[PDB]
């Protein structure tokens, strides 16, 4: 566990130390053969077996906050950790490298994931209910909860009817594929296969509010955000012609402001009624941004940015200034905060899935109590 910046310190309590680590086999040979002397005090991990040995894809934390589900790539699996028991509860293999997973229950008792071989897989504790193939390739996943329906965006343009583009939406009380919502993606080559072209033709991100009204927002590769209203099942708005692909999409706690982002690396915080951007920030380099979420240090509101330059930037919302910047030293593919405060679980490319602790953002969560005493010890040592 280290401390990267001066003013607002970040703490990488768990995570890889090196950018290019060797084979674990050679590391074990060296450790059991030669003489070593490691920093035994501050070197540890907080959750046993928090790795995958090849890479990682996605982390989420349950609504109850007792279950951490995390997928990894080789022998493509997902581990589930009982965070009260601070260890690996189980580890289940699959047939291909997971793209995106969403939990359903407040515990881990039901999960689903869009999976690289064009599949939706449904996991119980008892096992794995039979997967459903979707016709066209997937990009992300969302779940209408007030009316149970999982919906995936897809790349390419539809088969017949129109040439708009599709978000496959199937209900769970009904079971069938209801209907792909018609979302225009852009013009394609007429001489092409059914799985689109290599340059464009993609819907990327879906995001839905679960406590406010819930406008189903979709983001398309020509930089175009659309809005569908549930209980109407039709298009409401089209806005935001941007230069980058729309890859960022999340609502606020009130249910009014949206924050979307362009793969040049430019975030725009919009209102749902004022088409002028409420806030604009171009940041980092040309590497495409990946994820963004609102969060409140319980007095003040702030915003996450995650992009694969090893850059995560916590911005302010009421001012726009940069609060904190963190360089995760390796690639990273997903970010999540614990719902309590202060800890950011980050899925990466490296072996060890790494989490950050901001003391100025919040306290240590209800299952690692001594992490505050550990930051305490770091301020003792420095």
């Amino acid at each position: 566990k280290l401390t990267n910046p001066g003013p607002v310190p970040v703490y990488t309590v768990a995570g890889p130390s090196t950018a290019r680590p060797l084979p674990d086999w050679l590391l074990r040979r060296r450790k059991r053969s030669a003489k070593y002397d490691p920093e035994n005090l501050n070197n540890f991990e907080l959750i046993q077996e928090f790795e995958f040995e090849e890479a990682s894809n996605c982390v989420r934390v349950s609504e109850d906050g007792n279950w951490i589900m995390s997928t990894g790539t080789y022998k493509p699996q997902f581990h589930v950790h009982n965070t009260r028991e601070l260890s690996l509860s189980f580890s289940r293999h699959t047939n291909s490298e997971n793209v995106t997973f969403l939990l359903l229950s407040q515990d881990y008792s039901k999960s689903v994931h869009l999976q690289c071989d064009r599949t939706l897989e449904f996991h119980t504790p008892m096992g794995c209910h039979y997967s459903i193939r979707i016709p066209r390739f997937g990009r992300d996943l969302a779940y209408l909860r007030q009316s149970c329906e999982v919906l995936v965006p897809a790349v390419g343009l539809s088969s017949d009817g129109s040439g708009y583009g599709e978000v496959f939406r199937l209900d769970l009380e009904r079971g069938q594929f209801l209907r792909p919502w018609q979302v225009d993606v852009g013009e394609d080559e007429p001489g092409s296969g059914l799985q689109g072209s290599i340059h464009a033709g993609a819907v990327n991100v879906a995001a839905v509010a679960e406590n406010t009204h819930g406008l189903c927002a979709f983001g398309t590769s020509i930089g175009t955000v659309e809005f569908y209203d549930p209980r109407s099942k039709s298009r409401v708005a089209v806005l935001g012609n941007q230069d980058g692909e729309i890859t960022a999409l999340d609502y606020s706690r009130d249910g009014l402001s949206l924050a979307l982002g362009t793969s040049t690396g430019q975030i725009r915080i919009f209102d749902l009624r004022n088409p002028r951007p409420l806030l604009k920030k171009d940041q980092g380099m040309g590497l495409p941004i990946k994820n963004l979420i609102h969060l409140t240090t319980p007095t003040e509101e702030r915003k996450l940015l995650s992009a694969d330059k090893r850059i995560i930037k916590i911005w302010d919302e009421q001012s726009g200034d940069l609060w904190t910047s963190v360089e995760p030293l390796v690639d990273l593919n997903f970010v999540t905060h614990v719902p309590d405060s202060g800890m950011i679980l980050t899925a990466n490319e490296g072996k060890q899935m790494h989490c950050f602790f901001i003391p100025n953002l919040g306290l240590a969560p209800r299952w690692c109590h001594f992490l505050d005493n550990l930051v305490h010890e770091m301020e003792s040592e420095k």
Binding site: N40, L41, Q48, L86, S87, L88, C368, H369, F370, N373
Partner: protein
């Protein structure tokens, strides 16, 4: 909370009964491996500092280094970890252990004296305990004794004396069979090895030459037929 006090340099150890959690209070919320002074413990313990290395709480559970849960927790131990030995090969077993956080619910604390003080613990630092066995391999004996090239580990090895049975016979010595000691039989082993190498290559050279002249012979006969 009894304390298993161990002096690793002198090689001695002693359990110490400890009442007065008011005296013990400085140990609380300290991770395994943290350095703590023994001056708060007792007036005899002036100038000492000691590290902690684990212990067992009530209901007898071990304390594994590297776990932050202060309560009892439930890990999954693989082969090469502490507090578990594998029943069979390749086994991963889920066991419950106590985290590194020294709480009030412990029963024994493993403590190790790292720097002494001016006073002496009576049963702890006064008593010396030797190492059980001396070094066996030749190079480690050489590093232990700082011998020169001509200084004969065969006569500088450790010896141990015992008495046998037979109603008090002569005392009897024992010597540890120095391993990495070069002998003429080792020399002849290596020499016979390289002799085997050169004999084999000599054989293949001879047979290759004879096959060369036999192929010249058979090609000459086939062309004389032609």
């Amino acid at each position: 909370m009894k304390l298993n006090i161990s002096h690793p340099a002198n090689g001695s150890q002693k359990l110490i009964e400890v009442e007065d959690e008011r005296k013990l209070r400085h140990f609380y919320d300290k991770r395994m491996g943290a350095e703590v002074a023994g001056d708060p413990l007792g007036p005899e313990w002036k100038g000492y500092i000691l590290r902690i290395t684990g212990g067992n709480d009530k209901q007898g559970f071990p304390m594994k280094q590297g776990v932050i849960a202060p309560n009892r927790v439930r890990l999954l131990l693989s082969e090469g970890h502490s507090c578990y030995r594998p029943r069979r090969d390749g086994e991963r077993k889920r066991k419950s252990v106590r985290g590194c956080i020294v709480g009030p619910d412990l029963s024994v604390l493993a403590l190790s004296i790292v720097k002494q003080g001016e006073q002496d613990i009576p049963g702890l630092t006064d008593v010396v305990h030797p190492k059980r066995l001396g070094p066996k391999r030749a190079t480690k004996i050489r590093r232990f004794f700082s011998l020169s090239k001509d200084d004969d580990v065969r006569k500088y090895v450790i010896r141990r004396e015992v008495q046998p049975k037979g109603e008090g016979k002569k005392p009897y010595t024992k010597a540890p069979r120095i391993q990495r000691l070069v002998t003429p039989q080792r020399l002849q082993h290596k020499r016979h090895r390289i002799a085997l190498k050169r004999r084999q290559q000599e054989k293949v050279k001879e047979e290759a030459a004879e096959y060369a002249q036999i192929l010249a012979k058979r090609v000459a006969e086939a062309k004389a037929q032609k």
